[PDB]
């Protein structure tokens, strides 16, 4: 019944201004005491409260960001806008808008606080990245199986996928024929501002002599595709 | 300034289990406390509002309790969809505050990680940098520590870790730690070691190579 959806730019440069819009249905911002709030979630971290605006144009901001935050509404458009100035990479996060109920009313006057004590419907979230990086395809390097990567009759190998922007990258093994024992790790953002990840696979040490192993890497934003064959170092042969 | 402290920050359990998570507030927030469940890739979903009120459409297995500074969320009988992260939020004071979250995962027998170390490839070294990779494979529980030493010098600030989601089949995690150095620096040293600490190991396990021994 109630729905909210965030929109905005996926990518913004440092020092610029970020404008996010929340469009909603199922409630009206002229409903007594209703609120629309914003919350964000940095990659791998917890929820962080940003701001709230109410039907009477009352507004509140996170104290540590109140110099950069501005919240506004258009009641006839069923939209709320959040503006964040002077962004930095610290502001990379998924941004959620959310609905807060007004109080229980009788004859339009409040009789109970209860219902207000939660954000009851959330939007799906929008990912925003703050970065000064330019599009760049990855370099692919091998993680060669070895004596140093063995577990009795089990060996590990992989591909190191380095220095790309933006996300995301996709990795398969042997054009998709190898899926078992594959672990493709979430990307990390490096100090350079570029991402990197690794995919590894465990296989039988006995196969290393005969079976071929190739990681297929596709980075669509740079139209870069790479097939990287990974094999034992010469000394292990 | 208001702090909300959730405990535990992590717990494991099994389908059918009953679990309890607590939130403590540094100041009384009356009954103004909500509980949410969030699954990966999804927004938080409201379970309980006003400390103890069950949100419409929420399964009856969820319940909340408490008032003032101390609050509890209870799931009477864990279901598969309840493996997730849980947050509390207080709405008595501005700014509204969320707790740090409590991750609930599938319990299984303790499993020590298999540790592998990977030197940088000659190909990468050609381009001026060296990445050394330590892989911890198929362990449980999730908590694990990795230390890098280069010729016995502790490395700090030049590595990054990545962990997988819990495996749907065997319920384990894997983790990679990546040490980054300049080619020049990599070639000035010999012994590269990562030391792994985990509950399943009687004592910390060290995997290393000596690029000066050939």
């Amino acid at each position: 019944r109630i729905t909210l959806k965030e929109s905005g730019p996926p990518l913004v440069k440092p020092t610029q201004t970020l404008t996010l819009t929340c469009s909603f249905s199922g409630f009206s911002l002229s409903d007594f005491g209703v609120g629309v709030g914003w919350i964000r979630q940095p990659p791998g971290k917890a929820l962080e409260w940003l701001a709230i605006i109410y039907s009477d144009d009352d507004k509140r901001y996170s104290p540590s960001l109140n110099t950069r935050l501005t919240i506004t509404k258009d009641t006839s458009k069923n939209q709320v806008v959040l503006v964040m100035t002077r962004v930095s990479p610290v502001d990379t996060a998924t941004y959620f808008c959310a609905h807060r109920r007004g109080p229980t009313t009788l004859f339009g006057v409040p009789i109970a606080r209860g219902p207000v004590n939660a954000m009851d419907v959330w939007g799906q979230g929008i990912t925003v990245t703050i970065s000064s990086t330019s599009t760049k395809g990855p370099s692919v390097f091998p993680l060669a199986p070895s004596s140093k990567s063995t577990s009795g009759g089990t060996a590990a190998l992989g591909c190191l996928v380095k220095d790309y922007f933006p996300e995301p990258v996709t990795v398969s093994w042997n054009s998709g024929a190898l899926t078992s024992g594959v672990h493709t790790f979430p990307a990390v953002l490096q100090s350079s501002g570029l991402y990197s990840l690794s995919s590894v696979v465990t296989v039988p040490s006995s196969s290393l002599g005969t079976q071929t192993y190739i990681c297929n890497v596709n980075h669509k934003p740079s139209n870069t595709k790479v097939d990287k064959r990974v094999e034992p170092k010469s000394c292990d042969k | 300034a208001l702090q909300l402290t959730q405990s535990p920050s992590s717990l494991s359990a099994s389908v059918g289990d009953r679990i309890t998570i607590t939130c403590r507030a540094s100041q009384g927030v009356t009954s103004a406390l909500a509980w949410y469940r969030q699954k990966p890739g999804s927004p938080p979903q409201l379970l309980i509002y006003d400390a103890s009120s069950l949100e419409s459409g929420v399964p009856s297995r969820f319940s909340g309790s408490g008032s003032g500074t101390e609050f509890t969320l209870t799931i009477s009988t864990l279901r598969p969809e309840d493996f997730a992260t849980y947050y509390c939020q207080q709405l008595h004071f501005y700014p509204h505050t969320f707790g740090g979250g409590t991750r609930v995962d599938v319990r299984r027998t303790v499993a020590a990680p298999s540790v592998f170390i990977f030197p940088p490839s000659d190909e990468q070294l050609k381009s001026g940098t060296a990445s050394v990779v330590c892989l911890l494979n198929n362990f449980y529980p999730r908590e694990a520590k990795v230390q890098w030493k280069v010729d016995n010098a502790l490395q700090s600030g030049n590595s990054q870790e990545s962990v997988t989601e819990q495996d749907s089949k065997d319920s384990t995690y894997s983790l990679s730690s990546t040490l980054t150095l300049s080619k020049a620096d990599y070639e000035k040293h010999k012994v590269y070691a990562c030391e792994v600490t985990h509950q399943g190991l009687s004592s910390p396990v060290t995997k290393s190579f000596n690029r000066g021994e050939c």
Binding site: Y54, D58, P103, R113, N117 | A1, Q27, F93, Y94
Partner: peptide, 11 residues
Amino acid sequence: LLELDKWASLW
């Protein structure tokens, strides 16, 4: 002194 919520004073 922290500021009170919009509804902190409502029964």
